[PDB]
């Protein structure tokens, strides 16, 4: 592209910037407690600053069995505990037959039983995690009721309404604070998608199966719309459906709309080279910027989820719609699993640095102003100080993305003119850059000859490309102004982080834990919930076999694979935050690790 001017005015905070994109999801195949999944959700929960919050999970109610009605919740307990351990919430689709029990939602007895199952499970988890926590969950209907083969379950139009009423009453009986929505489907033009449009009319005007009341609770409306490789198309399609909802159903004018399957392209398992690397990452940011700049900044849009928490399959470790790249290394004894962080997951960590107020910004090319429906765009945020562990911040995230198309020839000259940064102590800036040249684990894999079972050393070389290229903190010029002139590739992401120096140093890393990978290798993962500030250079890790630093390139991602040359991993580990002014936080409580022949 021709040169782009990107202006950001830090003195001009316009309105809130809600972090509406912090969701992923997946469908188990016909698993959720496997070691593979345990590693996967550790990667998902390791996005800093709760950058991913929800995991929308299909078939949760196939993790419950019945007797008689009694319910065995053992498997469901295991999955929800695993999300909880990783600071994640279920996108709780009320989806499953309870291992064959439910077959017909026009059978009155089954409808009552469904309500009891939903009451029972809700009360259980309110008891297990607390009401405050469970009230944050998006309980949702069965996935895509108009595009699903219900098979051994009979789910008619009326059945779906009966089912819904049982979901709603089941949750109500447990607590009125619990949230329910649906249908989680595309809303094709009537007379298509009868169960989806039918749900809305039923909730607007229909009769409640249990109470006879006119209308039924619907806390949010969830749709699914994908891009067919176009980013802007997602937004376009959402607006058409939201307008039809608004016109047909006056009561839903302020009802929140979710797009909880908002992917570039339908079909997660289809190999696509652009899914492997920064191409997918930059498009995801582009879609988000489009939503903030062209919609939210007036339909009541509240949530966007990229449905990309699936585990990839041989022979396509990198090329599927996944946050991680899975390698089932079958030539070791015993065989083991390794995951790599793909650029899309790393990108969610850059988005996570965006703060609560949107700053004025303008992108232009030779004086023509361009909105986010273009290949180059920006999201800029500012943060107002909380306490003494906090201070003023600005985060500027620039994308260069031609959707699913990557051209190795293609670059863009950007001039970033940041002004209006308020006076503050120890002002510094840090840049983080991602492109396919420097930061593609898939690139490194292909350069090594695409080994199906990479060696330990080969895995090290691939992982070295996971993190962005980071420039050390530099002091900001006086007058609160900064001009940068980066060359950006297409695709690429550039985050410019400007921080004032908090009075106190970082807080403590917590919930350190170690997941075994194989002999001589483990994953360390931790929480940043008490660290306080986002102005972090790295997490210093120490190992006592006393304590010595594990030297590594800077990384703010809350997970590290330890794979020393020696295979000596027995001992204890501890982790602490290091800020932009070289001040450490307190070390986490340490975690022991013992390999036993
Ligand atoms: C290493 O061992 C594992 C055994 O766990 C092998 O995993 C299996 O890999 C195949 C893919 O080559 C998977 O089959 C695929 O399933 C999907 C979804 O149903 C389907 O779309 C594909 O066409 C294909 O049938 C299979 O699910 C998977 N099984 C498990 C339990 O993970 C892996 O292939 C072995 N690696 C090598 C190189 O032999
Ligand atoms: C519940 O299911 C689990 C695992 O599937 C099993 O270990 C447990 O014994 C079951 N409890 C029953 C049948 O009461
Ligand atoms: C985005 O730009 C294209 C032309 O490049 C235009 O046809 C489309 O309508 C635009 N969409 C929006 C929502 O601005
Ligand atoms: C939505 C979608 N049809 C699927 C896909 O695109 O692969 C997947 O994202 C999800 O499991 C479906 O509900
Ligand atoms: Cl996709």
Author numbering: 27 to 56, 64 to 101, 107 to 335, 340 to 587, 591 to 642
What does the primary publication say about this deposited structure?
Human α‐l‐iduronidase (IDUA), which belongs to the GH39 family in the Carbohydrate Active EnZyme (CAZy) classification, hydrolyzes terminal non‐reducing α‐l‐iduronic acid residues in glycoaminoglycans (GAGs), including dermatan sulfate (DS) and heparan sulfate (HS), through a two‐step Koshland double‐displacement mechanism.
The aziridine nitrogen is displaced by nucleophilic attack of the active site carboxylate to form a trans‐2‐amino ester (with the rest of the R group not visible in the electron density, presumably disordered due to its inherent flexibility; this region of the structure is exposed to the solvent). The observed 5S1 conformation of the covalent inhibitor 1–enzyme complex supports predictions for the conformational itinerary followed by α‐iduronidase GH39. The carboxylate group of the pseudo‐iduronic acid forms bidentate hydrogen bonds with the main‐chain nitrogen atoms of Gly305 and Trp306, the C4 hydroxyl group forms hydrogen bonds with Arg363 and Asp349, the C3 hydroxyl group interacts with Asp349 and a water molecule, and the C2 hydroxyl group forms hydrogen bonds with Asn181 and the nucleophile Glu299. In the covalent complex between IDUA and 2F‐IdoA, the nucleophile Glu299 is rotated by around 90° compared to the position observed in the complex here with the fragment of 1,8 and the fluoro group at C2 may preclude an interaction with Oϵ2 of Glu299, causing it to rotate.
